[PDB]
């Protein structure tokens, strides 16, 4: 099984104030999101979803489609030791 970590870059400054930029109902526009956490430093926030495949190559094709559907646009990196594809925005 392979996995897709969809990630966004956060800037953060016990309440923790952060922000990231997200695409909007218009695809060529991005808007800074007011994100707070309650119990500048840069952080990466990810969520991971799944698939089974025969190939590291077939898994990418699938995950690429997933991301394209969801509107995730970023850099793609792969680590075969943990068989994890990552898409990072920002």
């Amino acid at each position, epitope marked *: 099984t392979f996995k897709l970590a969809a990630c966004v870059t956060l800037a953060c400054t016990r309440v923790k104030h952060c*922000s990231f930029n997200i695409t909007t109902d218009v695809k060529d*526009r991005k*808007q800074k999101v*007011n994100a707070t956490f309650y119990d500048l430093y840069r952080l990466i926030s990810c969520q991971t979803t799944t698939t089974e495949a025969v190939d590291a190559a077939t898994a990418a094709k699938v995950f690429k489609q997933y991301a394209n559907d969801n509107g995730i646009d970023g850099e793609w990196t792969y680590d075969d030791a943990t068989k994890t594809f990552t898409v990072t925005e920002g």
Partner: antibody
Amino acid sequence: QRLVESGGGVVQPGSSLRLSCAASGFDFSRQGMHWVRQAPGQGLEWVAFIKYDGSEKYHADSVWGRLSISRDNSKDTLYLQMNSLRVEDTATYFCVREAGGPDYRNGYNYYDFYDGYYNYHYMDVWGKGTTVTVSS
Amino acid sequence: SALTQPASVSGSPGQSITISCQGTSNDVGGYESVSWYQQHPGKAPKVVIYDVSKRPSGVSNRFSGSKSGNTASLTISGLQAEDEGDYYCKSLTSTRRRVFGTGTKLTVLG
């Protein structure tokens, strides 16, 4: 885009006055705004700036905190609350728009929280000004 | 602390003049955010240069701007009668305040 100041007048030192500025012809709630003043025969002096959503404001040392900027976006109005007035506050007061828009990079237009404009660091619309004269 | 400008400059029509605007590393020297305003009697000022060297749409190509270290400059070439007026520089500062220069009266000797 038009800005129209009012509330100016002839007053005595120690008094208070509230200036208003009615904005029209642009989306007031997305743009930063300033007050700038000019005493008769003298130079421009920046008074204060307020962020589009009113979440942050800044004032010159010479006027903090006798003169305070605020805004009401539901009324497209900018205010300057002037307390403890001094003769040296005598000036024309201009309401002024901070030029602004998206930050364009990597093929994307980036906007601030709630779609607010980023600042372009120059002033692109001015009212005609309102006169304040402070004298004993 | 106001940015330092000469009190006055003057030139004949067709000549070039330059007005300086001296600040510190926390304003003029710290950002590419110097703008310049022309003001005629009884009117609001009007921007003629921003971001050091950029012209707003419609502003004559005779107006140009530059900066080196903590000093910015506005140059007006091919002086015309209508250039006469007062000129003010402005900069963003490190505390997000703004600050104007002391202003310069330009006379076009017509």
